[PDB]
Amino acid sequence: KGSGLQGHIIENACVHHIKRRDIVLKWELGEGAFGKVFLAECHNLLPEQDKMLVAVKALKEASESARQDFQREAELLTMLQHQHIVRFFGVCTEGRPLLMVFEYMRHGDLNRFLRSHGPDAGPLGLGQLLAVASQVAAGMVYLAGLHFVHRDLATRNCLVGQGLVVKIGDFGMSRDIYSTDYYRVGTMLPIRWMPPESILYRKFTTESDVWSFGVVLWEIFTYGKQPWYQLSNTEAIDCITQGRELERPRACPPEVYAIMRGCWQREPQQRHSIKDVHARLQALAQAPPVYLDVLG
Ligand SMILES: CC(C)(O)CNC(=O)c1cc(NC(=O)c2cc(-c3ccccn3)c(Cl)cc2Cl)n(-c2ccccc2)n1
Ligand SMILES: O=c1[nH]cnc2scc(-c3ccc(F)cc3)c12
């Protein structure tokens, strides 16, 4: 198992328990090899809300090892509390399937949102793209502050709620729903988002997270296009290990492309810290550069 949650547990809460009958399953949001994700109504969870919408992750396996891993993940999810981290509400361990309850983010994953609010399928403007980038960076600042390495930072692993609120978080099904974004070697790795040291040594750090954040900026400013989309997985590995960089997207002002390039320094020690990246994006989101994508 290679989730960022398990990776943090290995390197390092009173979990709230929700009664099964308080959860009313409404629709299936997705499914993977591990189980299913549902849209549900949850009673007795938030004070002024009787039928609040939640997203419910259901685990197919209920063995002793999966049950102990589930408990440790739930203790860690309970501890993660930030305005730009998806809210975790608790568990239901009344037999099979084990359930994890999260807030429901009505606009779905950020990749799906960017593609549905993009030009080739109105379009999000420069100020909205900068606000999305700044919120993702805020969530990454919080995780770096806890020495938490994400390991799979990408727009598919961010969620969008009402009022353009963007949060980091996923229901653990990206390797199934977005299998095209991963490549097997031995273990499914998101190679298009990884720096050279992670593809070569399979080592993930706060520095490889900053590189992936640079790739997130590129996804944002292309409205959700796949990095290196013209190339196969093996050709993408060669580009990255040879030191080739993604081209500046047309909607991307040179000022944001300079931030992307600072994330993509070949030497991990030469990359910008996420705190510096966040401060630069926050400044641009409050005062957008006068850039007209039509004029290049
Ligand atoms: C083959 C496998 C096992 O490898 C596939 N399983 C996975 O690939 C994978 C990746 C993740 N998600 C995380 O580990 C992860 C989750 C969050 C977060 C925080 C708050 C709310 C929601 N989500 C945040 Cl902020 C950062 C990370 Cl890095 N899985 C996951 C997700 C939710 C619960 C349990 C596991 N499973
Ligand atoms: O999710 C769906 N997709 C397509 N047709 C249907 S009919 C019913 C559902 C459904 C209702 C509640 C659930 F907890 C899960 C699934 C459904």
Description:
This protein has 296 residues and is an alpha+beta fold. It has ten helices and nine strands. The strands form three sheets. Strands 1-2-3-5-4 form a five-stranded antiparallel β-sheet. β6 (158-161) and β7 (165-168) form a beta hairpin. α7 (206-221) packs antiparallel against α9 (254-263). The ligand CC(C)(O)CNC(=O)c1cc(NC(=O)c2cc(-c3ccccn3)c(Cl)cc2Cl)n(-c2ccccc2)n1 binds next to α1, α2 and β5.
The CATH homologous superfamily of the largest domain corresponds to Transferase(Phosphotransferase) domain 1
Give the percentage of residues in beta strands: 15-25%
Largest sheet strand order: 1-2-3-5-4
Shape category: globular
Measured between the Cα atoms of the first and last residue, the distance is 44 Å
Helix percent reads 25-40%
Any idea of the CATH class of the largest domain? Answer: Mainly Alpha
Total domain count: 2
Largest sheet: 5 strands, antiparallel
CATH architecture of the largest domain: Orthogonal Bundle
Topology-level CATH name of the largest domain: Transferase(Phosphotransferase), domain 1
Cα-based radius of gyration, to the nearest Å:
19 Å
What ligands are attached or bound here?
A: the ligand CC(C)(O)CNC(=O)c1cc(NC(=O)c2cc(-c3ccccn3)c(Cl)cc2Cl)n(-c2ccccc2)n1, 5-(4-fluorophenyl)thieno[2,3-d]pyrimidin-4(3H)-one
Protein name: High affinity nerve growth factor receptor
Subcellular location: Cell membrane; Early endosome membrane; Late endosome membrane; Recycling endosome membrane
Family: Belongs to the protein kinase superfamily. Tyr protein kinase family. Insulin receptor subfamily.
